[PDB]
Amino acid sequence: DIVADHVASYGVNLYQSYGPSGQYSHEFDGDEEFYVDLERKETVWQLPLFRRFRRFDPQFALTNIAVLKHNLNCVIKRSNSTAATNEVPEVTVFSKSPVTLGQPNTLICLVDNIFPPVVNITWLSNGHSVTEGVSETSFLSKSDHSFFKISYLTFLPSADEIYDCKVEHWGLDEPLLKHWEPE
Amino acid sequence: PEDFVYQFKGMCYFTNGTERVRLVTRYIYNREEYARFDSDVGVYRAVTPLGPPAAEYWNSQKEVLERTRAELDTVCRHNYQLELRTTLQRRVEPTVTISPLLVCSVTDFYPAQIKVRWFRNDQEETTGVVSTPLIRNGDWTFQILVMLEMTPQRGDVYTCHVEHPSLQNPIIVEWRA
């Protein structure tokens, strides 16, 4: 590691050949300030404060991804097509606040050590898939160049509910079902 | 499936405000950094034998070497001035509760500076205090959980004192049997 007050990621550029996908995002002290919708060509800031004061032209992101797309083809040939190794992801589930029955809350599913950056994070209530109140972060960088992602579930704690986070990865033999109990 | 990954990380390291700034760009194949520009080093450098081709080509071109050195100013120093106007002024006050084996939950605060002290009556507890690491919520807020591993006597008052850069006065929450 390197000692500093604040670490900034002014260019977390990512490109991979699986279903040709990419990502561009700026991070500050471990938090994503924005990402760019590459198909929509739009900067998506992560805080109402940034949408008011901050501007980032999404054209620069598309330029960098095209260069990463180019370099990847070069280094693929120099490495004799050495593919990425699938890492075993670690999953943890916890609430944003202390759970009081009746008071709205949010469940947080942290998947860590993600590589390659391809993963499915899905929520279920108790027997049916939960699609409402679900949001996810972009792939967040780590020092060892793996990724971690976080998914959210806004819910209302009750007595007849125990929630599960389903993580699907290539480094996992079977889907991971992480458990959270209101008790 | 078979996947090939490329990453480019333009990282800026700030110490003592903008007095000590450092730029490290990283060229990564899968999970392997093969080339790198460090503003302290001044030129591109291969990290693994995969990067001498790129590093020597980039260094030979004068226009590439100047635009990368200028990024310490155009990117790192320039964007930091926008961080001072937005991110570095963010102040979210923490909510502090105590719940049953006694946990002082400190939730939804930012920045990361935090200090949790347990008090047994009039004596600060300094031994049986298990603190979880800072839990990043990923939505620009942190939480932390601090446990006190003793609740022997009735009539004793247990208070939790929390200090944060967003509070002019610490937050104090009490629990009793």
Partner: peptide
């Protein structure tokens, strides 16, 4: 009205 910039990556010379 300062537009933020990123780091522009260098291009390999293979093809």
């Amino acid at each position: 009205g300062q537009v933020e910039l990123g780091g522009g990556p260098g291009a390999e010379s293979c093809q």
